[PDB]
Structure formats: C-alpha cells, structure tokens
TrEMBL record:
Record GO biological process: base-excision repair, AP site formation; DNA alkylation repair
The organism of origin for this protein: Halalkalibacterium halodurans (strain ATCC BAA-125 / DSM 18197 / FERM 7344 / JCM 9153 / C-125)
InterPro entries assigned to the protein according to its UniProt record, in alphabetical order: Alkylbase_DNA_Glycosylase/TA, DNA_glycosylase, HhH-GPD_domain
Broad EC category: hydrolase
Location of the HhH-GPD domain: 49-203
The reaction(s) this protein catalyses: Hydrolysis of alkylated DNA, releasing 3-methyladenine, 3-methylguanine, 7-methylguanine and 7-methyladenine
Family in the record: Belongs to the alkylbase DNA glycosidase AlkA family.
Record Pfam families: HhH-GPD (PF00730)
Domain of life of the organism encoding this protein: Bacteria
SMART domains (UniProt xref): ENDO3c
GO molecular function, one term: alkylated DNA binding
Keywords noted in UniProt: DNA damage, DNA repair, Glycosidase, Hydrolase
GO cellular component: cytoplasm; protein-DNA complex
Protein name: DNA-3-methyladenine glycosylase II
Length: 218
C-alpha cells in the first residue's frame, strides 16, 4: 500500500502550524509519500538482508531466499524448512542468518505481536523490536515508518534527516542531530511526515542549493 500526504493534508497542516520555515519549504516541495509494506515479518527479514548492501545486491540475495521458500516469504514457518547452509549458499551472511532466526523466534513465541503494536506508544514498539539481535534503534525506527506506517517517529540518528535539518534550519551548517531534536518537538504527533520532507530537502534540494535561504530567491 502507498500513502500520499498533500501540502493541504491535516497532518502537514499540523506539522507546519508552529514552523514557518517548514511551511515555506513544503509549499515549494509539494506532496510526499510513504510506502507501506503489507507484511511486517517479511519486512523485518528484508530489512536484515539489506544491511551493508546496495539495493541491487540485496535484491539478488533476497530473490534467492524467495526461491528457497518457493515464493513470497510471508510466514516464519516457511524458514523452518530451510537450512542455514542453504541460506549461506544463497549469499546471506552468517550474522544475518542469526538475526533472521532471532526474528522468527520472536514472531512465533508471540513476543513480537504486530497487531498489539499497532496501538502501543512508539517507545514500546522500539523496545519490542530492538530486543531482536541485528535490530538497532535506527532499524526499528525505519521499520516503524516504512512498514508499520506509523506517523509519530523521529529518527534522531538518521544522517539523512540530519542533513535535511542543517539545510532547513541551519544555513547548511550547525549540528543536525541537535537541530532535529529541537525542531522535532514542533511536529508531534506527525513527526514521520516532517521526516519525509527532511529527506526530500536532503536529496534534490541540498544538491542544487546551499540552504533553504538560497532557494527563496525564486
């Protein structure tokens, strides 16, 4: 499922209410989007496969895992039937295999129930997720956004968001981490939506303009 936020969405209106710099930016940048992966377990496994690899690299390895399970990876039970040597021959590293196994353990033991989590404060979700080997804070945070579609997430550690923060609130200078913590307070409870714009600022706009200030020379 793919989800769009227009410049006149109530979420966007909320995040800009007490931030005119963000407002000035959003009126130029237009809509943002939020991809939502249907299947949570599938997403976690895919997230582990991606670590340290290009989208091209990871896609090759994951394609081969799908063949081992005989189609879409949907359910942890599918991996019981696939050995570790098999996964290694497919190119999944030994560490990534331990992480994937740990995800399975946590889904099938019931520790990690995704329906109860759609409901929990962000603080709790991040706990339940980072309990899994291989899943760090950042990983949990990206997972909450791009897979559980949660709009109240601010990944302070994202170098992307940090780059956007400096651009939008420094003059392309200053401490992205600190800027992001400070200005982020203005966006509750739709922080994820701001983050989409920060990412947008970090990409195309960062490349063509020093700061938000420069862009406002029409």
């Amino acid at each position: 499922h793919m989800r769009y936020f227009s410049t006149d969405s109530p979420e966007v209106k909320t995040i800009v209410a007490q931030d005119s710099r963000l407002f000035q930016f959003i009126e130029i940048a237009g809509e943002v989007q939020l991809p939502t992966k249907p299947n949570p377990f599938q997403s976690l496994v895919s997230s582990i496969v991606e670590q340290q690899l290009s989208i091209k690299a990871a896609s090759a390895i994951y394609g081969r895992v799908e063949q081992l399970v005989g189609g879409a990876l949907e359910k942890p039970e599918q991996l019981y039937r696939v050995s570790d040597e098999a996964l290694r021959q497919a190119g999944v590293s030994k560490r990534k295999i331990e992480y994937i196994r740990h995800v399975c353990e946590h889904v099938e033991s019931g520790r990690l129930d995704f329906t109860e989590l759609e409901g929990a404060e962000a603080t709790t979700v991040i706990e339940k997720l980072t309990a899994i080997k291989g899943i760090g804070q950042w990983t949990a945070e990206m997972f909450m956004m791009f897979s559980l579609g949660r709009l109240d997430v601010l990944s302070v550690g994202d170098v992307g968001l940090q780059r956007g923060a400096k651009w939008l609130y420094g003059n392309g200078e200053g401490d992205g981490k600190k800027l992001l913590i400070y200005h982020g307070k203005a966006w509750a409870p739709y922080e994820t939506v701001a983050c989409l714009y920060l990412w947008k600022a970090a990409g195309t706009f960062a490349e063509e303009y020093r700061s938000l200030e420069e862009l406002l020379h029409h």
